[PDB]
Enzyme design. Structure first.
Site, mmCIF file in Angstrom:
data_model
loop_
_atom_site.group_PDB
_atom_site.id
_atom_site.type_symbol
_atom_site.label_atom_id
_atom_site.label_comp_id
_atom_site.label_asym_id
_atom_site.label_seq_id
_atom_site.Cartn_x
_atom_site.Cartn_y
_atom_site.Cartn_z
ATOM 1 N N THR A 34 -6.221 10.741 -2.472
ATOM 2 C CA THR A 34 -5.813 11.606 -1.702
ATOM 3 C C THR A 34 -4.216 12.040 -1.794
ATOM 4 O OG1 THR A 34 -6.945 10.457 0.470
ATOM 5 C CG2 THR A 34 -4.745 11.329 0.864
ATOM 6 N N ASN A 241 -5.966 -2.078 5.872
ATOM 7 C CA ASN A 241 -6.208 -1.815 7.299
ATOM 8 C C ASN A 241 -7.577 -2.701 7.623
ATOM 9 O OD1 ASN A 241 -4.085 0.004 7.856
ATOM 10 N ND2 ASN A 241 -5.325 1.624 6.679
HETATM 11 C C1 LIG Z 1 -2.048 8.031 -4.027
HETATM 12 C C2 LIG Z 1 -3.191 7.531 -3.880
HETATM 13 C C3 LIG Z 1 -4.398 7.928 -3.135
HETATM 14 C C4 LIG Z 1 -5.665 7.445 -3.096
HETATM 15 N N1 LIG Z 1 -6.539 7.928 -2.064
HETATM 16 C C5 LIG Z 1 -7.755 7.534 -2.347
HETATM 17 C C6 LIG Z 1 -8.799 8.189 -1.789
HETATM 18 O O1 LIG Z 1 -8.516 9.487 -1.238
HETATM 19 N N2 LIG Z 1 -10.087 7.601 -1.687
HETATM 20 C C7 LIG Z 1 -9.990 6.398 -2.387
HETATM 21 O O2 LIG Z 1 -11.419 5.664 -2.167
HETATM 22 N N3 LIG Z 1 -9.311 5.372 -2.944
HETATM 23 C C8 LIG Z 1 -8.024 6.386 -2.858
HETATM 24 N N4 LIG Z 1 -6.852 5.607 -3.682
HETATM 25 C C9 LIG Z 1 -7.383 4.212 -4.445
HETATM 26 C C10 LIG Z 1 -7.649 4.706 -5.972
HETATM 27 O O3 LIG Z 1 -8.932 5.439 -5.903
HETATM 28 C C11 LIG Z 1 -7.847 3.621 -6.583
HETATM 29 O O4 LIG Z 1 -8.683 2.536 -6.389
HETATM 30 C C12 LIG Z 1 -6.336 2.895 -6.938
HETATM 31 O O5 LIG Z 1 -5.312 3.782 -7.255
HETATM 32 C C13 LIG Z 1 -6.417 2.009 -8.150
HETATM 33 O O6 LIG Z 1 -6.722 2.359 -9.484
HETATM 34 P P1 LIG Z 1 -5.399 2.571 -10.416
HETATM 35 O O7 LIG Z 1 -4.784 1.311 -10.573
HETATM 36 O O8 LIG Z 1 -5.981 3.248 -11.702
HETATM 37 O O9 LIG Z 1 -4.575 3.555 -9.834
HETATM 38 C C14 LIG Z 1 -5.806 6.570 -3.851
HETATM 39 C C15 LIG Z 1 -4.729 5.491 -4.504
HETATM 40 C C16 LIG Z 1 -3.498 6.108 -4.411
HETATM 41 C C17 LIG Z 1 -2.381 5.559 -5.376
HETATM 42 O O1 LIG Z 2 -2.817 8.055 2.792
HETATM 43 N N1 LIG Z 2 -4.319 8.184 2.444
HETATM 44 O O2 LIG Z 2 -4.883 9.197 3.217
HETATM 45 C C1 LIG Z 2 -4.788 7.162 1.898
HETATM 46 C C2 LIG Z 2 -6.492 7.480 1.640
HETATM 47 C C3 LIG Z 2 -7.114 6.583 0.750
HETATM 48 N N2 LIG Z 2 -8.484 6.442 0.860
HETATM 49 O O3 LIG Z 2 -8.853 5.403 0.424
HETATM 50 O O4 LIG Z 2 -9.204 7.411 1.421
HETATM 51 C C4 LIG Z 2 -6.388 5.268 0.487
HETATM 52 O O5 LIG Z 2 -7.136 4.365 -0.345
HETATM 53 C C5 LIG Z 2 -5.039 5.192 0.503
HETATM 54 N N3 LIG Z 2 -4.289 4.414 -0.339
HETATM 55 O O6 LIG Z 2 -4.736 3.090 0.017
HETATM 56 O O7 LIG Z 2 -3.248 4.608 -0.994
HETATM 57 C C6 LIG Z 2 -4.167 6.317 0.935
#
Ligand SMILES: Cc1cc2nc3c(=O)[nH]c(=O)nc-3n(C[C@H](O)[C@H](O)[C@H](O)COP(=O)(O)O)c2cc1C
Ligand SMILES: O=[N+]([O-])c1cc([N+](=O)[O-])c(O)c([N+](=O)[O-])c1
Ligand SMILES: CCCCCCCCCCCCCCCCCC
Length: 354
Positions: A34, A241
């Site tokens: 996101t 959450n």
């Molecule tokens: C800025 C940000 C936005 C994220 N948005 C989503 C998202 O839209 N949907 C989702 O399932 N996970 C979201 N996550 C979780 C990531 O997909 C991922 O599981 C998490 O960043 C851990 O992987 P990494 O250590 O390689 O960053 C988000 C994480 C971050 C940091």
């Molecule tokens: O800000 N956000 O909308 C958002 C959304 C998701 N998600 O999973 O769809 C996240 O995992 C996180 N997150 O945990 O960083 C943030």
């Protein structure tokens, strides 16, 4: 063990056949991220097109969470896929990714109790039960979360319908498939955990009942676009959450073999650091799923190219999603391939879309 990393991550560049419809050029996925940069109509911008397009060396991109209808919105400027204009915006994204030799799934989202009425005209926030989360919307001025309305079975039927319609739109928008967002405390995950699901009808109480919504959504989407183009992200461990409950594990014990029957493109873990062990799961999230599910699994969460490669070599999972390093390094795949230095992610980087 994963920490005993070696001096080669060649296996990350193996071709991986997901199924008869889709083959990935490598095992590296761009995790869903996101960014909150869609326009006022929740349409993907041309800046978003460029952002995704430059990451097309990934075997597969999973888009940022994309809302299925207005009452799914919980954060500013998150794109949707329910209007014609949104479909057209996404088509620019997918066309650009494909032209660069990439592949992309959309992640279909409903936030459930994490929605906020500020974003959709003061309407009802929906969830399995009237259980409010603590606090307020991040990075916004004083938007306190509200007590949701417990969805009726008619609400649920409409939600399944709208997930299915969004999936159809995804095909019009030229995506290769959909990842259903069943993770990270959002709507589908809310049915799967006791903290959020206190229902006493056919959608609550027992593992079969609590899994029912997830499976109805999965089945409706498969019926629209096919199992080869359908993946699912799940969070068996509560962390975002969501309060923990020792009874949640048996819900996933039931769900995972049921999911296997649908022969999905993949199941994907939703977690931030997969090195964390969950008491209630008897170990890491990926290891729990790997022990209860025998088809393609996407690992994620604080992996380096080196530790991901080792995990995959050790049969812990099949594909690696990379999140924050893909924000810090648009050229992540090339840098890993060429053993070049990667920049560490900083939260400050979220202010820029590059
Ligand atoms: C800025 C940000 C936005 C994220 N948005 C989503 C998202 O839209 N949907 C989702 O399932 N996970 C979201 N996550 C979780 C990531 O997909 C991922 O599981 C998490 O960043 C851990 O992987 P990494 O250590 O390689 O960053 C988000 C994480 C971050 C940091
Ligand atoms: O800000 N956000 O909308 C958002 C959304 C998701 N998600 O999973 O769809 C996240 O995992 C996180 N997150 O945990 O960083 C943030
Ligand atoms: C802007 C990016 C996201 C910022 C918020 C981070 C969300 C994830 C938090 C990680 C885990 C915290 C709580 C875990 C409890 C159970 C762990 C065993």
């Amino acid at each position: 063990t994963i920490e005993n990393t070696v001096n080669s991550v060649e296996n990350l560049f193996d071709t991986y056949k997901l199924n008869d419809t889709i083959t990935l050029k490598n095992r590296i996925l761009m995790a869903p991220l996101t960014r909150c940069m869609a326009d006022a109509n929740l349409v993907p911008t041309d800046d978003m097109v460029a952002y995704y397009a430059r990451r097309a060396e990934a075997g597969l991109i999973i888009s940022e969470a994309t809302i299925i209808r207005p009452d799914a919105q919980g954060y500013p400027n998150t794109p949707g896929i329910f209007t014609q204009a949104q479909i057209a915006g996404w088509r620019k994204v997918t066309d650009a990714v494909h032209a660069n030799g990439g592949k992309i799934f959309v992640q279909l989202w409903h936030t459930g109790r994490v929605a906020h009425p500020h974003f959709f005209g003061g309407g009802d926030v929906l969830a399995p039960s009237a259980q409010k989360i603590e606090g307020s919307v991040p990075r916004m001025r004083e938007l306190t979360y509200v007590t949701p309305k417990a969805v009726t079975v008619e609400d649920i039927q409409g939600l399944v319908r709208d997930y299915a319609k969004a999936a159809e739109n995804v095909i019009e928008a030229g995506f290769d498939g959909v990842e259903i967002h069943g993770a990270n405390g959002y709507l589908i995950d809310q049915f799967l955990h006791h903290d959020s699901n206190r229902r006493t009808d056919e959608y609550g109480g027992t593992p079969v009942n609590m899994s029912r919504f997830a499976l109805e959504v999965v089945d409706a989407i498969i019926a629209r676009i096919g199992h080869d183009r359908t993946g699912l992200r799940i969070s068996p461990g509560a962390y975002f959450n969501m309060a923990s409950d020792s009874r949640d594990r048996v819900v996933f014990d039931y769900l995972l073999p049921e999911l296997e029957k649908r022969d999905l493109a993949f199941v994907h873990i939703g977690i931030f650091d997969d090195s964390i062990e969950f008491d209630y799961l008897g170990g890491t999230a990926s290891s729990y799923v790997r022990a209860h599910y025998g088809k393609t699994l996407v690992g994620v969460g604080s992996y380096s190219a080196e530790t991901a490669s080792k995990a995959i070599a050790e049969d812990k999972f099949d594909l690696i999603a990379i999140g924050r390093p893909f924000i810090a390094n648009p050229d992540y795949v090339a840098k890993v391939r060429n053993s070049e230095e990667l920049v560490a992610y900083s939260d400050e980087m979220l202010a820029s879309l590059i």
